[PDB]
Amino acid sequence: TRFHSFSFYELKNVTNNFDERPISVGGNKMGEGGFGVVYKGYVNNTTVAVKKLAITTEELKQQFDQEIKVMAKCQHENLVELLGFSSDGDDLCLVYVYMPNGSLLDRLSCLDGTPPLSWHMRCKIAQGAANGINFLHENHHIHRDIKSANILLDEAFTAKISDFGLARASEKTVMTSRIVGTTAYMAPEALRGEITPKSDIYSFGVVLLEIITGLPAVDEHREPQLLLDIKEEIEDEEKTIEDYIDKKMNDADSTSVEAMYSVASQCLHEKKNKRPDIKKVQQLLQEMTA
Numbered sequence: 001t002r003f004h005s006f007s008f009y010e011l012k013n014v015t016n017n018f019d020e021r022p023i024s025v026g027g028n029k030m031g032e033g034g035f036g037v038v039y040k041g042y043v044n045n046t047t048v049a050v051k052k053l054a055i056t057t058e059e060l061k062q063q064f065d066q067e068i069k070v071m072a073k074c075q076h077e078n079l080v081e082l083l084g085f086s087s088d089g090d091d092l093c094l095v096y097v098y099m100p101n102g103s104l105l106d107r108l109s110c111l112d113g114t115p116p117l118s119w120h121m122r123c124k125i126a127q128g129a130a131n132g133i134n135f136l137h138e139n140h141h142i143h144r145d146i147k148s149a150n151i152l153l154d155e156a157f158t159a160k161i162s163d164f165g166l167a168r169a170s171e172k173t174v175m176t177s178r179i180v181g182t183t184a185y186m187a188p189e190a191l192r193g194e195i196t197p198k199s200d201i202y203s204f205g206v207v208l209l210e211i212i213t214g215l216p217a218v219d220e221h222r223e224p225q226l227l228l229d230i231k232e233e234i235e236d237e238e239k240t241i242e243d244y245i246d247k248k249m250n251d252a253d254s255t256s257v258e259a260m261y262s263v264a265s266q267c268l269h270e271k272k273n274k275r276p277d278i279k280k281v282q283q284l285l286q287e288m289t290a
């Protein structure tokens with residue numbers, strides 16, 4: 001692929017000079033995605049996300065350059081799609097196809113009055129996100145920030161993995177001094193600085209628990225604070241998955257929720273070598289809707 005090279009002034013124009021009012025009150029600010037703020041825009045009838053990046057300049061410049069490198073190689077119906085970018089001006093900007101149902105985080109939480117996702121829709125989002133991670137692993141990439149904030153949802157609730165700024169090209173276990181990820185999602189070995197696709201798998205399991213419960217992975221004002229902990233509550237038969245299923249669903253049945261929870265639990269083994277590879281996660285999520 002290649003991408004349109006936008007003037008900073010063009011992207012200022014399409015985002016109403018990066019207007020900071022929310023979309024919900026007719027503004028252009030949609031939310032935050034990594035080390036940047038992201039604005040809604042129109043280029044010739046095409047609705048776009050413009051992500052303007054604000055950590056060192058050379059670090060920020062590296063993640064921008066990484067995102068372009070990953071989006072050049074990787075094109076799949078379960079990955080967000082870059083249209084262009086802007087280096088010339090002050091701020092570095094990435095221009096994507098708009099995702100009209102925003103992030104899985106926001107929908108799981110029914111942000112801005114959106115209705116709760118059904119069990120049927122959740123199953124498709126899961127299969128979809130796993131098809132996304134699979135393409136990235138097949139094309140020898142490690143995301144390193146799989147979380148519901150980074151699974152976007154299009155007009156038909158198609159799951160789209162996004163934010164490849166930290167993605168590592170990994171032919172196949174390195175280790176690192178700069179440890180990166182969102183704690184609440186990261187595996188043991190990722191938090192000790194190991195880099196391996198097997199960490200992406202753990203992180204996915206957290207996202208399956210988010211899907212099953214509608215609980216965000218961390219919540220300071222909740223017990224337990226870490227959704228992960230609920231695995232241990234369940235394995236120690238203090239509670240069943242039934243006690244934790246999102247109550248904002250009328251269409252979840254025991255069999256398919258347990259099926260999904262079994263994947264989440266397999267995904268979440270503490271021993272990275274006992275976890276299934278994304279290919280097996282696909283097989284199991286596809287097997288789960290018979």
Ligand SMILES: CC(C)(O)CCn1cc2cc(NC(=O)c3cccc(C(F)(F)F)n3)c(C(C)(C)O)cc2n1
Nearest residue numbers: 030031033038049051080096098099100102103112
């Ligand atoms: C009315 C309604 C149902 O509330 C929906 C409103 N809504 C719509 C959104 C679209 C979004 N994102 C994208 O379009 C998008 C597309 C590609 C890439 C990227 C990223 F790389 F910048 F992360 N973001 C967001 C993000 C995820 C950027 O915050 C939030 C939203 N909220």
